[PDB]
Amino acid sequence: RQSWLPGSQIPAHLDTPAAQALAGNFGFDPLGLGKDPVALRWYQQAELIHCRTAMAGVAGILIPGLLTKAGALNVPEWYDAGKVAIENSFAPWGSLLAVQLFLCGFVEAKRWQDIRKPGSQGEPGSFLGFEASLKGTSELGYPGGPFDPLGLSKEADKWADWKLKEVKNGRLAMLAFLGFVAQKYATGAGPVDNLAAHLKDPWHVNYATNGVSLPFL
Amino acid sequence: DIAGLTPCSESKAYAKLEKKELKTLEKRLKQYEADSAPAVALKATMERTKARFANYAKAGLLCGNDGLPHLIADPGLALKYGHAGEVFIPTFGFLYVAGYIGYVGRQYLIAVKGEAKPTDKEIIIDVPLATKLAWQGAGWPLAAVQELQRGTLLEKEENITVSPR
Amino acid sequence: KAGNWLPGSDAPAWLPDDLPGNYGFDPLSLGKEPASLKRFTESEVIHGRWAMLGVAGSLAVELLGYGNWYDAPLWAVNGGKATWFGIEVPFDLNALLAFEFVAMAAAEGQRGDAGGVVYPGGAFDPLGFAKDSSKSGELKLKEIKNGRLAMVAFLGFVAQHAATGKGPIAALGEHLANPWGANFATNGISVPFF
Amino acid sequence: LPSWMPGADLPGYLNGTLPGDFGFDPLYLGQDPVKLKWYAQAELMNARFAMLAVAGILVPELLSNIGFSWPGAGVAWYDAGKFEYFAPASSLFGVQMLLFAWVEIRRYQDFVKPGSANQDPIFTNNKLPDGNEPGYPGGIFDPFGWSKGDIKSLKLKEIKNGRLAMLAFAGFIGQAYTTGTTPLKNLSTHLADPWSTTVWQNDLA
Ligand code: CLA
Ligand code: CLA
Ligand code: CLA
Ligand SMILES: CC1=C[C@H](O)CC(C)(C)[C@H]1/C=C/C(C)=C/C=C/C(C)=C/C=C/C=C(C)/C=C/C=C(C)/C=C/C1=C(C)C[C@H](O)CC1(C)C
């Protein structure tokens, strides 16, 4: 098997049939958090949700960020998108935050009750009729039905590969967003401009020169 | 402002105290030479002093009638008026490190109770095991809430209670 | 089996054959369960009838020249008075709201008490069609197909007026004027990167 | 038995059934047979669009230097987006995506279930023959009576010209980004002086 550190002793809780059947297992647990299988279950759920929302957010940063260097899509910088949006908008930000709290709390409550009980949300008479297709698909965190419309999740031969691509791209996306934050506080411009200013002069413009990222040198 | 005071930037007493400290310091400085290490240390003190006053003025501190900074210990009030860095952030920092120390210690104790002589490994520290557990708990709060939610944090009533009632 | 929405692909197992508009169209597997499927049949037919009525209404309004469907309710926010075919309507917004609430509440409660019934009879059959239950199945098929078409057309109305702000027949007229010069690529809000 | 490196060990999963099987995969991209199928179909499609593209960049420019007078007088291949047509490019994009949605989803439906998209939905007499071969349709898509010969030769030829055309279109992109000129003019100034017009020569400016 692959390991993060070849030659390192892989911990015994990440070496089970239950833990090796997880997407993107690389035996990485230096701080031994996942000693409890229930806790490992919950943490896997946390990783999946963070992956999906991280991909969505970072794509939202990049793709308008890239395409604005072309002609179309005049988009302001991601750290200024809220202001301009709310000046474009019709309501104050408080009411928008309240509405999103409601509409997201409902859904997250659903998903949470499905985490505590696996076959929960599908029981007769609960919803007006989507109770038909709100069960799980035998692997928690990966529902079916109205999710996965295109039927890509039906074939069994591509299954682990779709999983593994998801988790790898997601981990990379989380790293990307943390990078967005740090580059915002460090240099003071958009990430696309950081990429351009680094490709323009690599040996002079990096975090060894920005004067904040390591002040002792 | 916040309970009848003013920020230190326009506080008259602040600048008077600053001038007084510089005055005594230059008074000590006067009697030496211009190359002497006494004068070197004295000018270092001047630099650190003026830098300290500028740093306290920059952070938006609040001074009473004595010209001294006052800390605000109230979540709503400090978070509303921009003072989260004087009690709030410090208390979460301290709780993190203190729970960290306690959790590491507790894990050591359970790690050594399972041996043949628990007292020797208490008087003579198992250094490899101690360093190992010293790393393994940097995220303690997650392990703490898991131990709480599984009911292993608390012993049941097999504790020795005083006799009699 | 009125058809198959995707030649070659197998029909879903949960759709029963004797059913109007049974094309086997279900990628999401939404009607795999019985009771939910029955409820969805009810909802589809009812939405179809209401869509037919609304689309026919907006067409009649614009075709007989009384503004669009968007400025029919214009008389209530900006002060004025309702109309029908060239005659004034003597009511207030709250008056029609009250009579609408009472009438619709009464009618829909009455309907919503007889279990789930989609085809009544007798006094909702006053002309004498669908008596033999033979060609009634075909009439069910025609009903549901025209209903699906009406729903799609009404969603078209909402999107079209949300895009260009003109009425249906006005949009069709100008599109017949210059076909390539004005449709949903000259929209400027449909496809963004143009 | 041909190789891309005569003597070197070929990967075991390649067996000559694919057209143009030269045993070239130093990154081992096609170990799973499913990925091999998808990659093969992708190669065919990329190849055909490359061949049509390179034809559509050579032929207008080749017939530009000869001096005809259709309004495509040699403007460019990359300046095809600033010309007055008889329709703005938006509706072009719309009709394009509608028609190609129809065609490409139809083709994908053939690929997932081979032997299922053969007959004409409207005029249900017209039907493709049962020589399905996902990626090689047949019937009216081979209208002039070919495929009579040993088609492995013609498949091999199609894939060779496709690979050459893909590299050619990559060439058009690279040359037009670097020198910023038309490609037959690049061949013109290279046939003018082959020894002082090279890549190493131009990249030192
Ligand atoms: C140790 C107890 C204690 C005490 C005496 C106070 C005292 C105060 N808090 Mg407070 N607070 C505390 C703990 C405490 N805090 C803690 C632990 C939190 C974190 C949950 C907060 C979070 C908080 C917020 C978010 C706000 C206050 C505010 C206030 C002020 C008026 C409200 C009040 O007295 O409610 C009585 C308080 C208690 C009985 C103690 C329980 C703590 C509750 C949760 C705080 C109640 C907030 C209150 C409902 C807000 C009223 C709004 C006001 C405009 C009327 C007052 C100076 C408000 C403020 O800024 O005033 C200007 C305000 O907005 N507090
Ligand atoms: C009013 C909504 C509605 C409802 C509830 C139904 C219900 C049904 N249809 Mg149906 N249908 C509708 C509208 C509707 N139809 C329309 C408008 C068309 C024309 C496009 C069709 C065409 C159609 C075919 C061709 C077939 C069905 C079939 C069915 C049955 C099984 C499928 C199922 O589980 O449906 C459940 C449906 C829903 C839960 C729909 C809810 C709406 C979803 C959740 C959101 C849609 C959002 C929309 C895409 C947004 C567009 C915005 C725009 C800007 C892009 C079921 C009785 C099958 C059958 O046997 O017929 C009886 C079948 O083969 N339908
Ligand atoms: C006020 C009295 C009243 C009452 C008591 C009822 C009662 C009923 N109606 Mg009903 N109806 C009424 C008025 C009323 N209606 C009016 C005025 C209309 C418009 C003419 C309709 C249109 C209507 C349709 C079309 C349907 C019903 C249905 C039903 C039944 C479902 C009950 C239920 O749980 O729904 C609870 C419903 C809700 C809490 C609201 C659902 C809101 C939906 C999901 C949002 C739709 C999108 C929204 C409109 C935004 C669109 C924007 C637009 C620009 C496109 C029930 C018997 C359904 C039925 O018979 O199925 C069995 C059905 O299909 N009714
Ligand atoms: C593994 C492990 C294990 C062992 O045991 C121990 C240790 C080592 C400690 C660990 C590690 C860990 C880590 C590292 C983690 C990380 C994380 C992250 C980064 C996340 C993020 C994450 C991230 C995320 C989600 C993100 C998201 C985002 C978003 C939404 C965005 C949004 C937006 C947009 C769109 C745009 C607009 O305009 C604005 C805004 C609003 C801004």
Ligand SMILES: CC1=C[C@H](O)CC(C)(C)[C@H]1/C=C/C(C)=C/C=C/C(C)=C/C=C/C=C(C)/C=C/C=C(C)/C=C/C1=C(C)C[C@H](O)CC1(C)C
């Ligand atoms: C089927 C399926 C299946 C699979 O599985 C999945 C999926 C695909 C998702 C699905 C789909 C779905 C869909 C598409 C749906 C649609 C719907 C609609 C559109 C409705 C409408 C609906 C609509 C409707 C009713 C409408 C109605 C209307 C009306 C009444 C009107 C009214 C009016 C009038 C008197 C006139 C005036 O001037 C005004 C007004 C007031 C305006």
